mmCIF file of C-alpha atoms in Angstrom:
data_model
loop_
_atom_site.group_PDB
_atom_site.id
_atom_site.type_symbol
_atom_site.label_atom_id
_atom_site.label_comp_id
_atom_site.label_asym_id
_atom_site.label_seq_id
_atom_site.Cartn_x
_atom_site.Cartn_y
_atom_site.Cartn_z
ATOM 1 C CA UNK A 1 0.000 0.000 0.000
ATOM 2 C CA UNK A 2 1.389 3.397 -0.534
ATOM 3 C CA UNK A 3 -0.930 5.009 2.094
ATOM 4 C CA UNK A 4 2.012 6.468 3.854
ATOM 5 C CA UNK A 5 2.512 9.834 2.851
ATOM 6 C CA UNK A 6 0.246 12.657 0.761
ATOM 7 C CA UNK A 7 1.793 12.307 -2.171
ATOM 8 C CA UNK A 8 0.855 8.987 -3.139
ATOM 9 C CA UNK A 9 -2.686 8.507 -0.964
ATOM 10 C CA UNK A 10 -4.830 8.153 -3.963
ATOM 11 C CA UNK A 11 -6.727 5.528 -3.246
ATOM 12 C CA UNK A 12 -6.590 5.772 0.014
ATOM 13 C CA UNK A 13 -7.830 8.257 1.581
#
C-alpha cells in the first residue's frame, strides 16, 4: 500500500 505519505494517498484516503 502506498498510504504512507500525501503524495501517493490516492486511493486511500
Amino acid at each position: 500500500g502506498c498510504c504512507s505519505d500525501p503524495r501517493c494517498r490516492w486511493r486511500c484516503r
